[PDB]
């Protein structure tokens, strides 16, 4: 009230989602339809099946409002497909800038960064007993990081997979090592 100059001002976050509320077989990815049909379904339906909400696990997350089936596709981790030595340059850069580093790879040649270019798959937390995993698929010569499910993922459950460092997983199978 105009006299007590208070702290807790800067956030160091490029995104600003923290609102007052932050309200957290038919489909081809569960069918035996071919991989181009599943991949064409994935980009059209990851925009409308899941959503980004504020995460009590860590930061902001991916809180689905739908009974996600077992083994099906959920989201595609698409961002800056940079070379493997541009990884260290952007790691030093966003160490100097404070933005969190998001570098999950396909192989040991080029690593998908998710800092400038990215999607809603930046907001995937880590549970050591997760509900998803990933498999390297092949579409049109390109490779795509596709998050395949594990079980029936209910309404409200945040989406996590195995990344392969103490985590906020909350699970009892916790490794605390992600190197």
């Amino acid at each position: 009230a105009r006299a007590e100059v208070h702290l807790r001002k800067s956030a160091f976050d490029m995104f600003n989602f923290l609102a007052s509320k932050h309200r957290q077989a038919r489909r081809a990815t569960s069918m035996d339809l071919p991989m181009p049909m599943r991949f064409r379904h994935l980009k059209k339906t990851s925009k409308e099946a899941v959503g980004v909400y504020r995460s009590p696990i860590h930061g902001r997350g991916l809180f689905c409002k739908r009974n996600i089936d077992a083994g099906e596709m959920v989201i595609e981790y698409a961002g800056n497909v940079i070379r493997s030595i541009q990884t260290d340059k952007r790691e030093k850069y966003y160490d100097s800038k404070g933005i969190g580093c998001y570098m999950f790879r396909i192989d040991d040649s080029e690593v998908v960064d998710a800092t400038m270019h990215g999607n809603a798959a930046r907001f995937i937390n880590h549970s050591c007993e997760p509900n998803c995993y990933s498999r390297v698929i092949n579409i049109d010569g390109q490779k795509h990081i596709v998050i395949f499910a594990m079980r029936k993922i209910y309404r409200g459950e945040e989406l996590t997979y195995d990344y392969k460092l103490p985590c906020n997983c909350g699970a009892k199978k916790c490794r605390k090592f992600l190197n």
């Binding site: 070379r83 030595i85 040649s109």
Partner: protein, 176 residues
């Protein structure tokens, strides 16, 4: 002289006669299978077809640089820009030297007595920047990283076109 089969970047356009080096997008540096060790070894990189806006980095590099490294990333690989001759080594910004011209018979030399180095950008025996000095003892790979798909040759024939003047190199008919 047979080029590299495994210790190179296989997505680059190394030709089928294995005497012509053409690069692609992304600074993956193709390195030939003949890393110099000692004595005096000089090869040429005969630039023939090169479009403009190509920062054709030529120089020297050690095996601890990546196959996906740009030529001039770290403390082991030199750098040579077409634009204003700006060199970046140990990540140091130095608008230092000159560039080059299209069609010049390139090919550089690093001096390895069996230490005393002569690291100058040897374009046709003409100075394009006295680059660096005082290397360690070890293997030094050929170092070609490209920004576009330019068609340049590489020479291993002993009757060289434009070597450094009064260079007592060993002829490259003893490397393969």
């Amino acid at each position: 002289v047979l080029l590299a089969l495994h210790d190179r970047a296989p997505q680059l356009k190394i030709s089928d006669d294995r005497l012509t080096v053409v690069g692609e997008k992304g600074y993956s540096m193709v390195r030939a299978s003949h890393g110099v060790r000692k004595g005096a070894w000089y090869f040429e990189i005969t630039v023939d077809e090169m479009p403009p806006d190509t920062a054709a980095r030529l120089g020297w590099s050690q095996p601890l640089g990546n196959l996906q490294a740009p030529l001039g990333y770290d403390k082991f690989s030199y750098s040579w820009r077409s634009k204003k001759g700006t060199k970046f080594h140990q990540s140091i910004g130095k608008h230092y030297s000159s560039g080059y011209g299209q069609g010049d018979v390139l090919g550089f030399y690093i001096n390895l007595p069996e230490p005393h180095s002569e690291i100058i950008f040897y374009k046709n025996g003409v100075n394009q920047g006295v680059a660096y000095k005082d290397i360690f003892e070890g293997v030094y790979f050929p170092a070609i990283s490209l920004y576009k798909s330019c068609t340049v040759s590489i020479n291993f024939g002993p009757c060289f076109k434009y070597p450094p003047k009064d260079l007592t190199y060993r002829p490259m008919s003893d490397m393969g």
